[PDB]
């Protein structure tokens, strides 16, 4: 599923991401825009052989099991394919564990390089929430 900007903001708010660990809703929408272009089916392979999955591009090296990343962890206790669903629940629940691990949203390279220090409120402007 390819979400609209306000559609995704509303789904993320309903799932508890507004101000989660201090990160306003616009930070999460900006991250998803630049990680996946709002597409739940996005995948990208990394140089180390791991793969990133879904709307927030969660990495199989640490967070999910895809059967093809030797010696990886599965810290969210899910198959990576669960992160490509049109229902964003699994991706949101896993992102909450990531953002809590000490490094905040710096775990998402595109957030660090394209959202951090910008006016992220613009990503929810006009939306009914
Ligand atoms: Cl915001
Ligand atoms: Cl594996
Ligand atoms: Cl933080
Ligand atoms: Na893994």
**DSSP at 58:** E
- Residue whose structure tokens are 């206790």: 77
Strands 43-45 and 58-59: unpaired
Closest CA to 92 of 37, 12, 35, 34: 12
- Residue whose structure tokens are 């394919």: 81
- Residue whose structure tokens are 């509303």: 10
What was the structure determination method? Answer: X-ray
The rounded Cα 11 to chain-centroid distance in angstroms is 13
Q: Which residues keep their CB under 5 angstroms from ion ligand 4?
A: 60, 65, 69, 72, 74
Closest CA to 64 of 28, 34, 90: 90
Angstrom distance (rounded) from CA 105 to CA 112: 7
Q: Which residues pair with 51 in a beta bridge?
A: 45
**List 35, 66, 87, 119, catalytic entry:** 35
- To the query of whether residue 7 is one of the catalytic residues in this protein, the response is no
Angstrom distance (rounded) from CA 60 to CA 76: 10
CATH of the domain at 11: 1.10.530.10
Q: Which domain holds residue 41?
A: 1-129
Task: Indicate the SS3 state at residue 52.
Answer: strand
Radius of gyration of the chain (CA): 14
Q: Which residues pair with 53 in a beta bridge?
A: 43, 58
The rounded Å distance from CA 115 to ligand 2 centre is 31
């Amino acid at each position: 599923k390819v979400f609209g900007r306000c559609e995704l903001a509303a789904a993320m708010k309903r799932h508890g991401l507004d101000n989660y660990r201090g990160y306003s809703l616009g930070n999460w929408v900006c991250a998803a825009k630049f990680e996946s272009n709002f597409n739940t089916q996005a995948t990208n392979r990394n140089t180390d052989g791991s793969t990133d999955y879904g709307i927030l591009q969660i990495n199989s090296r640490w967070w999910c099991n895809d059967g093809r990343t030797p010696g990886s962890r599965n810290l969210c206790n899910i198959p990576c394919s669960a992160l490509l669903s049109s229902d964003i629940t699994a991706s949101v629940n896993c992102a909450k564990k990531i953002v809590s691990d000490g490094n905040g949203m710096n775990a998402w390279v595109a957030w660090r390089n394209r959202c951090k220090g910008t006016d992220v409120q613009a990503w929810i402007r006009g939306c009914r929430l």
